[PDB]
Amino acid sequence: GSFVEMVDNLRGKSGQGYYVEMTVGSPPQTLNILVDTGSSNFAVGAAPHPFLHRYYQRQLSSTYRDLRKGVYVPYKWEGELGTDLVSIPHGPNVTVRANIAAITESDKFFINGSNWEGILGLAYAEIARPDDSLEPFFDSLVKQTHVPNLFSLQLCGVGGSMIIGGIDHSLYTGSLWYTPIRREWYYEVIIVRVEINGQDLKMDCKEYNYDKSIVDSGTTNLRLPKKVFEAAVKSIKAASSGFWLGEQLPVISLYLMGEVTNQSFRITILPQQYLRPVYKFAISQSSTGTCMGAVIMEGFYVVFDRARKRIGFAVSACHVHDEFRTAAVEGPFVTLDMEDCGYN
Ligand SMILES: COc1cc(Br)cc(CN2CCC(NC(=O)CCCS)CC2)c1OC
């Protein structure tokens, strides 16, 4: 119902993702940790990298255990794997034994000037490194505690909330609308229709999910596939008459597969969401598929209902809106052949 302790527990810089305070080891070592639904490793700085405010000092932790194994993660960082006791101060009052990759070497990972020292992957074991046998933090948390298999994110344009183990109904207006998680690797969803200011792109819905479509807190932009990206910008440029290519400095609706056969709902983002104050055009091309980043997520309260293999969307109580236009989650809509849109 209400999780006052966990409200406003996220911070960050625009374009750099959101981080939460966590503790590792015994006695607890406090670190700021990126919240990433697009990856599945819990990894922290473990050596005195010049950019870092602080780092995990294994020698100070009585509860640390070595797994005597190494991990190389390119996007790069490299680490030594182990386990230790982990807590989230402004989260549930629990302590779990989780896997931690102690980052010993990295290139273009840590950001000069940033206030975070690690990454928390909230996605599933499938995309975990080195392989799926390394249990992600959230999978460990659910198994070792009575914390429900669910988390939600209210990312605001920089602070936000990560509600672990439930939903805070103060953080959204209207109703929650759910889309199925297609496969438990990334938080994979299916987009069935795309409108630019009320007009359908008339594109094959297979193109909207070319390779995959994901909800990703680790990505800043709405990243559309090349073919969709091209057609989207074409309608975006026509609606308002280098920059469009992300080389320099009208609402958008995505229809998502519903819970029921032939039933969909739409989520609608304003310019106030895809114009990121630096302004920059926060919609870019991709070759890995559709990535619903902070652009999408900042308009909505997002429920990662892992228990029921679904993701909830509702209008965020903190989203930037004026007296003219407001962000929206609306349904139900009738959409046939939705299963076809999934790439195989
Ligand atoms: C500031 O730097 C980061 C902040 C945060 Br929060 C997370 C990361 C790492 N994260 C790794 C997974 C990526 N997503 C995918 O591979 C799916 C394709 C999406 S189009 C997104 C970036 C970051 O990079 C190091």
Structural description of this entry:
The structure is a monomer. This protein is mainly beta and 344 residues long. It has helices at residues 137-144, 205-208, 226-239, 271-274, 294-297; strands spanning 10-12, 18-24, 29-36, 42-45, 65-73, 77-87, 96-106, 118-121, 151-156, 159-164, 172-180, 191-196, 199-200, 213-215, 222-225, 252-257, 263-269, 275-276, 280-281, 283-286, 290-292, 300-305, 310-316, 328-334. The strands form 4 sheets. The chain has a 6-stranded mixed barrel. The longest helix has 14 residues, at 226-239. It is globular and about 60 Å long. It starts with 9 loop residues before the first strand and ends in a 10-residue tail after the last strand. The protein binds the ligand COc1cc(Br)cc(CN2CCC(NC(=O)CCCS)CC2)c1OC. The ligand COc1cc(Br)cc(CN2CCC(NC(=O)CCCS)CC2)c1OC is lined by residues 16-17, 34-36, 38-39, 75, 109, 111, 119, 216-219, 223, 286, 288, 291. The active site is at residues 36, 216. It is found in: Cell membrane; Golgi apparatus, trans-Golgi network; Endoplasmic reticulum; Endosome. It comes from Homo sapiens (Human). Disulfide bonds join 156-318, 205-341.
The domain count comes to 2
Ligand identities: the ligand COc1cc(Br)cc(CN2CCC(NC(=O)CCCS)CC2)c1OC
Beta-strand proportion? 35-45%
- Strand order of the biggest β-sheet: 2-3-8-4-7-6
Q: Could you name the CATH homologous superfamily of the largest domain?
A: Acid Proteases
Counted by DSSP, the helix tally is 5
End-to-end Cα distance, whole Å, is: 39 Å
CATH topology assignment of the largest domain: Cathepsin D, subunit A, domain 1
- Text of the CATH class of the largest domain: Mainly Beta
The major pleated sheet works out as: 6 strands, mixed, barrel
Percent helix, as a range, is under 10%
